[PDB]
Design a protein around this ligand. Structure first.
Ligand SMILES: CC1=C(CCC(=O)O)c2cc3nc(cc4[nH]c(cc5[nH]c(cc1n2)c(C)c5CCC(=O)O)c(CCC(=O)O)c4C)C(CCC(=O)O)=C3C
Ligand SMILES: [Ca+2]
Length: 308
């Protein structure tokens, strides 16, 4: 078999897990009671917990099945490795090794590369495999250039746009976003900001929406500048300059409904559109839609074919 190491951020399974999860995010430094209360309040606002654990499972095992149903050159076996709760990246590599997996392909459920995200997933996976003696991990770094990925988002955007009155489409803007990172990554030409711009450009040329902008969301609690503009601020700025009637938010750096979409878009961006008198749109996330499982199947199968 070939191991398929499918990686993602992780989410609390239970309300009681929030403290240890947030501590892991903060590199072992326990957050304060006020920080914990803020995060717990956001989870409460979206219904109590996030759907990300179930979606991530459906993505990983749906990918495994799409691959195995489409060819008989190899058998893939999926192992889920999460960044900040069990099963951790290291636990997934240990499981492959214990099962006798000799070779693996890895994919992060985030289509863009950065030094804070995919690089860190890959370093941890490689370091765990090195200590164990295997498996050899063949990492996919990014996959936003996949045409089926771009077309999936364009199709969702066009479906939403077709329900906007034709006389208001000229007053509609597409806001393309991803998770913000510290601005300092630009100092060393990290590819992440340019990958998001390329993604926005590729999508724009396949949709009927005539206006678009790139923003960022979910910047952390630090004392340094992060990539912007923030999507809330950008919404205000664009309404100020152009008086758009419809804002369509596609946080294409993410692949699932989770806290950073359900709260940071569907609550925080809608607060702004409500304040200025515009309509809020946020198309369905890829989740485990068959189209999205086909994107991932294409990516992994191309990777496997290029290794051989
Ligand atoms: C680049 C990136 C992605 C995208 C790529 C990938 O998918 O890996 C991502 C995804 C996610 N981030 C998530 C959650 C959180 N991220 C946080 C904090 C942070 N994220 C960061 C980066 C990223 N994060 C960074 C540099 C910090 C600051 C750390 C610090 O402060 O030193 C915090 C702490 C509180 C806060 O900052 O709001 C939380 C709760 C969830 C799960 C949501 C759920 O449970 O549904 C998901 C999918
Ligand atoms: Ca925030």
């Amino acid at each position: 078999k070939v191991g398929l190491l499918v990686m993602a951020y992780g989410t609390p399974y239970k309300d009681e897990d929030i403290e240890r999860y947030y501590t892991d995010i903060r590199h072992g430094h326990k957050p304060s009671e006020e920080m914990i209360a803020d995060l717990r309040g956001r989870y409460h606002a979206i219904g109590g917990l996030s759907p990300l654990a179930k979606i991530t499972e459906a993505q990983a095992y749906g990918l495994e099945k799409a691959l195995n149903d489409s060819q008989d050159e190899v058998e893939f076996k999926a192992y889920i490795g999460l960044k900040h709760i069990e099963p951790f990246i290291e636990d997934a590599v240990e499981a492959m090794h214990k099962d006798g997996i000799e070779e693996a392909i890895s994919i992060v459920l985030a289509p863009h590369y950065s030094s804070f995200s995919v690089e860190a997933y890959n370093k941890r996976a490689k370091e765990a495999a090195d200590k164990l003696g295997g498996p050899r991990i063949n990492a996919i770094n990014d996959w936003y250039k996949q045409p089926k990925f771009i077309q999936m988002w364009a199709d969702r955007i066009n479906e939403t746009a077709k329900q906007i009155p034709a006389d208001e489409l000229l007053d509609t803007v597409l806001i393309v976003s991803a998770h913000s990172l510290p601005e300092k990554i630009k100092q060393h030409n990290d590819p992440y900001p340019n990958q998001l711009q390329e993604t926005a450009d590729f999508i724009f040329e396949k949709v009927v929406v005539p206006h678009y902008a790139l923003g960022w969301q979910s910047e952390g609690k630090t004392g340094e500048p992060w990539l912007g503009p923030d999507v809330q601020d950008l919404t205000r700025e664009l309404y100020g300059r152009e008086k758009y009637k419809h804002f369509i938010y596609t946080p294409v750096g993410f692949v699932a409904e989770h806290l950073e979409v359900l709260y940071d878009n569907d609550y925080e961006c809608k607060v702004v559109t409500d304040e200025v008198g515009a309509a809020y749109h946020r198309p369905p996330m890829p989740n485990s839609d068959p189209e999205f499982l086909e994107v991932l199947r294409t990516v992994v199968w191309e990777k496997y074919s290029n290794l051989e």
